[PDB]
Design a protein around this motif. Structure first.
Motif, mmCIF file in Angstrom:
data_model
loop_
_atom_site.group_PDB
_atom_site.id
_atom_site.type_symbol
_atom_site.label_atom_id
_atom_site.label_comp_id
_atom_site.label_asym_id
_atom_site.label_seq_id
_atom_site.Cartn_x
_atom_site.Cartn_y
_atom_site.Cartn_z
ATOM 1 N N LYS A 1 73.795 4.233 25.773
ATOM 2 C CA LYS A 1 72.981 3.617 24.791
ATOM 3 C C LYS A 1 73.130 2.122 24.840
ATOM 4 O O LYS A 1 72.255 1.421 24.386
ATOM 5 N N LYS A 2 74.184 1.656 25.473
ATOM 6 C CA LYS A 2 74.463 0.237 25.645
ATOM 7 C C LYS A 2 73.972 -0.314 26.980
ATOM 8 O O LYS A 2 74.048 -1.512 27.226
ATOM 9 N N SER A 3 73.462 0.551 27.847
ATOM 10 C CA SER A 3 73.129 0.129 29.200
ATOM 11 C C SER A 3 71.693 0.449 29.562
ATOM 12 O O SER A 3 71.329 0.483 30.741
ATOM 13 N N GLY A 4 70.879 0.685 28.543
ATOM 14 C CA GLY A 4 69.460 0.915 28.740
ATOM 15 C C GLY A 4 69.127 2.253 29.372
ATOM 16 O O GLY A 4 68.084 2.384 30.009
ATOM 17 N N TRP A 5 69.997 3.250 29.203
ATOM 18 C CA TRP A 5 69.703 4.574 29.755
ATOM 19 C C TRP A 5 68.501 5.211 29.080
ATOM 20 O O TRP A 5 67.916 6.150 29.623
ATOM 21 N N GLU A 6 68.120 4.726 27.899
ATOM 22 C CA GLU A 6 66.932 5.286 27.259
ATOM 23 C C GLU A 6 65.671 4.933 28.052
ATOM 24 O O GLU A 6 64.605 5.498 27.814
ATOM 25 N N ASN A 7 65.796 4.007 29.000
ATOM 26 C CA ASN A 7 64.678 3.634 29.864
ATOM 27 C C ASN A 7 64.805 4.272 31.238
ATOM 28 O O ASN A 7 64.006 4.008 32.143
ATOM 29 N N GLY A 8 65.826 5.108 31.398
ATOM 30 C CA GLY A 8 66.031 5.805 32.656
ATOM 31 C C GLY A 8 67.493 5.873 33.036
ATOM 32 O O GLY A 8 68.237 4.913 32.849
ATOM 33 N N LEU A 9 67.914 7.015 33.567
ATOM 34 C CA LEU A 9 69.307 7.189 33.953
ATOM 35 C C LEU A 9 69.552 6.503 35.293
ATOM 36 O O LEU A 9 68.725 6.597 36.199
ATOM 37 N N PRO A 10 70.686 5.799 35.419
ATOM 38 C CA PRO A 10 70.970 4.995 36.616
ATOM 39 C C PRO A 10 71.348 5.800 37.858
ATOM 40 O O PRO A 10 70.963 5.423 38.955
ATOM 41 N N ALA A 11 72.082 6.893 37.692
ATOM 42 C CA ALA A 11 72.544 7.680 38.839
ATOM 43 C C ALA A 11 72.551 9.167 38.504
ATOM 44 O O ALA A 11 73.605 9.802 38.481
ATOM 45 N N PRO A 12 71.369 9.719 38.232
ATOM 46 C CA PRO A 12 71.252 11.103 37.778
ATOM 47 C C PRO A 12 71.391 12.130 38.897
ATOM 48 O O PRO A 12 71.188 11.823 40.082
ATOM 49 N N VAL A 13 71.744 13.347 38.500
ATOM 50 C CA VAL A 13 71.581 14.530 39.336
ATOM 51 C C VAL A 13 70.513 15.406 38.691
ATOM 52 O O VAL A 13 70.034 15.094 37.609
ATOM 53 N N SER A 14 70.132 16.493 39.353
ATOM 54 C CA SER A 14 69.142 17.412 38.800
ATOM 55 C C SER A 14 69.809 18.413 37.873
ATOM 56 O O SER A 14 70.942 18.827 38.115
ATOM 57 N N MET A 15 69.112 18.780 36.803
ATOM 58 C CA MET A 15 69.603 19.788 35.862
ATOM 59 C C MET A 15 68.453 20.689 35.391
ATOM 60 O O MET A 15 67.436 20.197 34.905
ATOM 61 N N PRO A 16 68.607 22.015 35.535
ATOM 62 C CA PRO A 16 67.577 22.937 35.040
ATOM 63 C C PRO A 16 67.439 22.900 33.529
ATOM 64 O O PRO A 16 68.432 22.801 32.797
ATOM 65 N N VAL A 17 66.196 22.971 33.067
ATOM 66 C CA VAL A 17 65.879 23.145 31.654
ATOM 67 C C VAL A 17 64.845 24.253 31.567
ATOM 68 O O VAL A 17 63.816 24.169 32.220
ATOM 69 N N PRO A 18 65.094 25.282 30.755
ATOM 70 C CA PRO A 18 66.262 25.457 29.889
ATOM 71 C C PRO A 18 67.497 25.981 30.616
ATOM 72 O O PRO A 18 67.395 26.832 31.503
ATOM 73 N N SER A 19 68.662 25.477 30.219
ATOM 74 C CA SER A 19 69.951 26.013 30.665
ATOM 75 C C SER A 19 71.073 25.351 29.900
ATOM 76 O O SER A 19 70.901 24.269 29.361
ATOM 77 N N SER A 20 72.238 25.985 29.879
ATOM 78 C CA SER A 20 73.477 25.265 29.585
ATOM 79 C C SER A 20 73.916 24.548 30.865
ATOM 80 O O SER A 20 73.792 25.121 31.937
ATOM 81 N N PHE A 21 74.441 23.323 30.793
ATOM 82 C CA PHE A 21 74.803 22.653 32.055
ATOM 83 C C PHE A 21 76.115 23.151 32.669
ATOM 84 O O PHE A 21 76.321 23.003 33.873
ATOM 85 N N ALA A 22 76.988 23.747 31.864
ATOM 86 C CA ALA A 22 78.397 23.903 32.257
ATOM 87 C C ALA A 22 78.615 24.707 33.548
ATOM 88 O O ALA A 22 79.413 24.303 34.399
ATOM 89 N N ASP A 23 77.947 25.845 33.704
ATOM 90 C CA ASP A 23 78.378 26.762 34.764
ATOM 91 C C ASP A 23 77.758 26.522 36.135
ATOM 92 O O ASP A 23 78.057 27.242 37.095
ATOM 93 N N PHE A 24 76.923 25.497 36.261
ATOM 94 C CA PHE A 24 76.396 25.158 37.580
ATOM 95 C C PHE A 24 77.446 24.513 38.454
ATOM 96 O O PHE A 24 77.460 24.706 39.673
ATOM 97 N N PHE A 25 78.308 23.719 37.830
ATOM 98 C CA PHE A 25 79.201 22.841 38.590
ATOM 99 C C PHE A 25 80.412 23.556 39.178
ATOM 100 O O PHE A 25 80.761 24.661 38.763
#
Ligand SMILES: O=C(O)[C@H]1NC(=O)[C@H](O)[C@@H](O)[C@@H]1O
Ligand SMILES: O=C(O)[C@H]1NC(=O)[C@H](O)[C@@H](O)[C@@H]1O
Lengths: 577, 576
Positions: free
Chosen positions: A34-58
């Motif tokens: 919120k301090k680095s302008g991520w609301e305008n885009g994530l700087p180093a994202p990975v892909s994440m399915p929606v809908p899903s819980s994120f935990a068990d992919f990794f």
């Protein structure tokens, strides 16, 4: 209240576009997004399915167990034709809490991870252009929001969730996400309530719109033929020879709500509803004036890899299994489920006890807790009230109930619940053992009493199971002597059971012990007239926090996590037939 | 093709609406649906998830094992604004064959259960109204379509699928479904081919549209900055200081294809591509002119309950597991996968051997050949522009020892070459009975893929020392032939029950899986021309039940719910 809970539909007046798919995703351990302008885009994202819980992919512990701030982003094209409509982002849920941004602008925040989040992007949306949505989510646990827990900090600055509840802290965007367009004056809410009159029925209704124009309400039968029509935001629909929604024998009418401009229609909302009454009379639960004994399970939204991620496939398999056991009921332990679960229970004629995430409630953080609890209660009931399947609200799971201040707290919750349910259907909560008959001060608030009991598991298990039975009958004898004249429903009873662990004579954790434990419990249930339901814990093995008492989650499932029956499943099937 | 294979996108010119969700569904064991007007609506449907395989939802055998005709139905509102567009239903797949109806009207039929089905509903669609789609599907197996099998009729007339292949006959609407709207003149197809020129690259292309207006082609880098622009339906994009797409180190440009008429753009198609070259040089597989050793797995589209149902979650977990093993490659055994798998391979820098469903292989052969070539055309047209796709596998264990087989496969490889603008390596997987002395088809291949089970089906267990000897014997024969081509092992593995431990190891134990793999590695490493190893299988998967399959196939290195058996770390350590 400052938005609609209505499930999105598409027609001449309302449009919807799914945002399900692969989103961008980034963990934020330093809490600097919120301090680095991520609301305008994530700087180093990975892909994440929606809908899903994120935990068990990794494949790394620190990713799976991540606790703190984390971010989702996607882009979508908005049709030019949506220009100047009321445009909303609608999340099935955001777990546990978060802030929604659109095109770089903060739109809304929400606390509570199991109910819809509506974000009005009308003033920031860009019709005929690519739009961006970014969500800051947090999954920490505390004692001022539901479900309760704590957050532990390792000497390395890493956060760990510490639940006060027995299920894994799954989180993320676990349900479908939509972007929708509504007419400037729209149907925002409605409520239906039913009366049976001989062969006929009355559908009492209330409609809330965002404007002042006239409202027409129609009711269509299952073939789409008109059976009733009426004018006004409040009124009654008379249905001759009504086909009632029955247990495991559903029939659904379609309510149609129109906002008219004289000649012209401004908005139309349609939804399937089922004509049915639920009432408590003495120790009996009545559906359409006939006693029903509840038979079924506590469930979870839980499935391999997806976590709590919604998928219609999980709904389909679970309902086929439920039907195969001859069940008629489940409780949404321990949080409201995806709306789709109720839609399907409507179709299949299943009874639902709908439960707010008030679990793990065992100082001056209570007023705040009470506020969240009431808020979740309001949202749950507003969202779910028009499902024929929903026949009761569960407003807690195992809170402290034996003090005076506990009483005042729950009086507020029940009062709130009563104001929001147009049907005033039965309200309850699940009590644990320490809510002794001689000590509990909250059970008078309940229309019927739910007990979670583990006589034969946590108390006097194994070689002591005969002692367990006596202790069980002793407690039930004490309830009986109180002559409360209310129904009792067992909302939990079960044993951890490892599929394939066989032993003769049985041992705790064996398939055989699960059977014998169930048989003992049935003998006790059947000894008391006021018992009116049995919901086993759990429908299926499910994930919990790791520990010395949980062997890859909770194994009290009657089905395995991949939805196959243990030996005890047949015991239920035979008994419930 | 009389339709586009292009993945659907949404922009000013192209619209899409998802039809995924709960559809209506009805089994049709008496084959009465069409004569009963079911295309106008199913009379007594149940709900069925889409995408999913239907089989594993049910609790009754006859439902799970249902073979024959069955129907899907749903309704959808079409925005009025789609009026005057070309409107299409797009099924990721329809397994195995089906006829699409829309608003009561027959639109198209398709045979082949693992590639997109496009149905033009322009003339029957009703914009601004509720529309209806009904699909009649059949999941029987025969010898004139892929994958091959038989259909058994029990005395009561009940049908049972009898595969000639080792995977469960899942079927239904297993992939996403959309309704889409295209401009009346649209980009229908395009092809890219690459050339490396020092630090620069050339992107050669051709574009196929449904009209005659001018085409502009732009290339954007990963940040969206223009790096090349040119005009024409055929052309060359020159890229200065190209950032090549590398194994496990992807970089994706975005190609932008515009149709214009001089009052402006008529259509715009965008897709990510990766600049990379693939070629075979002697016994080396060259990626961007550097040798690459393939490391990975044969997979399946297979997951608990959903069957072959597509889900991004399965993709995400599987790639995280693949990366954790240090793999760089998988084969789409034994059918093209959902397009999303290739999209993700593109982003993760994985290499794919893309395989047509020619598995399980008289007067019926000409029909089979036509189906085989049709599937090949559809697969290559759909997948050619993925940088991940480095090779086409055109069969898995067919007969190869006769002149008849040679003539047959000559036609398949010829067709594949004509369809692939890049002319990338082509291959097929050979069973052991395709002896080096007897096989007539391996010369058709640019590199040779072998499925071998020395130490499982041949001399397993107490005879594993003999298995190793026999294996070296066969490989010595291949060596003495000096074919000067790369060999890739596309299958090797042992059924392995999670939790079955034994010392000394036995067939089916976790320890034996480890020892088997170690023995196979010793053999691979003994021959210079071995250039890849893809283990069978990434994960345990469903098969027809039988005395040889203990709840499906357990040759997975991972369990069906995607957790590593002991042998998983053997791969991790070796591939690191
Ligand atoms: O011990 C159990 O298995 C269960 N007992 C309870 O009392 C809880 O309400 C459940 O959440 C928990 O999973
Ligand atoms: O026996 C097996 O486990 C595998 N062997 C093969 O040769 C086939 O190509 C596979 O489909 C099959 O699953």
């Amino acid at each position: 209240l400052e938005y609609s809970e209505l499930y999105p539909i598409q027609n001449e007046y309302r449009m919807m576009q799914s945002l399900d798919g692969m989103w961008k995703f980034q963990f934020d351990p330093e809490e600097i997004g919120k301090k680095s302008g991520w609301e305008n885009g994530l700087p180093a994202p990975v892909s994440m399915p929606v809908p899903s819980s994120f935990a068990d992919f990794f494949t790394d512990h620190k990713e799976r167990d991540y606790c703190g701030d984390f971010w989702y982003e996607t882009e979508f094209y908005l049709p030019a034709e949506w220009r100047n409509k009321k445009i909303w982002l609608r999340f099935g849920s955001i777990t546990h809490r978060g802030t929604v941004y659109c095109n770089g602008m903060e739109i809304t925040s929400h606390e509570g991870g199991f109910l819809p989040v509506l974000a009005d992007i009308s003033t920031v949306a860009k019709p005929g252009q690519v739009n961006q949505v970014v969500v800051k989510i947090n999954n920490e646990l505390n004692e001022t929001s539901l479900p309760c827990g704590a957050t532990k900090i390792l000497n390395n600055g890493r956060k760990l969730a510490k639940p006060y509840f027995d299920f894994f802290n799954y989180s993320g965007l676990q349900r479908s996400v939509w972007v929708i367009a509504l007419p400037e004056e729209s149907v925002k809410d409605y409520s239906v309530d039913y009366e049976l009159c001989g062969t006929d029925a009355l559908v009492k209704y209330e409609v809330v719109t965002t404007g002042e124009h006239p409202v027409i309400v129609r009711l269509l039968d299952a073939e789409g033929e008109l059976v009733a029509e009426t004018e006004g935001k409040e009124g009654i629909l008379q249905v001759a020879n009504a086909r009632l929604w029955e247990v495991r024998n559903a029939y659904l009418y379609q309510i149609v709500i129109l906002i008219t401009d004289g000649n012209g229609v401004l908005d139309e909302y349609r939804e399937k509803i089922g004509i049915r009454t639920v009432r408590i009379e003495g120790t009996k639960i009545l559906l359409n004036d006939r006693p029903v004994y509840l038979k079924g399970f506590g469930k979870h939204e839980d499935f391999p890899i997806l976590g709590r991620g919604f998928h219609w496939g999980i709904v389909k398999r679970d309902f086929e299994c439920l039907k195969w056991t001859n069940a008629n009921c489940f409780r949404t332990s321990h949080y409201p489920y995806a709306e789709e679960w109720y839609q399907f229970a409507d179709e299949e004629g299943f009874l639902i006890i709908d439960e707010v995430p008030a679990v793990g409630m065992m100082a001056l953080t209570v007023p705040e807790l009470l506020k969240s609890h009431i808020a979740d209660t309001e949202e749950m009931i507003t969202r779910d009230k028009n499902h024929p399947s929903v026949i009761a609200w569960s407003l807690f799971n195992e809170p402290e109930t034996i003090t005076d201040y506990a009483y005042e707290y729950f009086k507020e919750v029940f009062a709130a619940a009563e104001t929001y349910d147009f049907q005033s259907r039965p309200m309850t909560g699940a009590f644990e053992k320490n809510s002794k008959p001689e000590l509990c001060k909250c059970y008078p608030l309940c229309d019927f009493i739910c007990l979670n009991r583990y006589y034969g598991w946590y108390i006097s298990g194994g070689p002591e199971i005969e002692e367990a039975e006596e202790l069980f009958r002793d407690e039930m004898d004490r309830w009986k002597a109180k002559e409360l004249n209310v129904p009792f429903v067992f909302t939990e009873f079960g044993t951890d059971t490892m599929a394939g662990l066989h032993k003769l004579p049985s041992i705790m954790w064996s398939e055989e012990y699960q059977k014998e434990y169930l048989e003992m419990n049935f003998r006790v249930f059947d000894s008391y007239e006021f018992v009116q339901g049995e919901l086993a814990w759990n429908f299926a093995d499910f994930q919990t926090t790791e520990g010395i008492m949980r062997v890859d989650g909770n194994h009290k499932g009657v089905f395995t996590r991949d939805r196959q029956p243990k030996a005890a499943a047949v015991v239920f099937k035979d008994r419930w037939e």
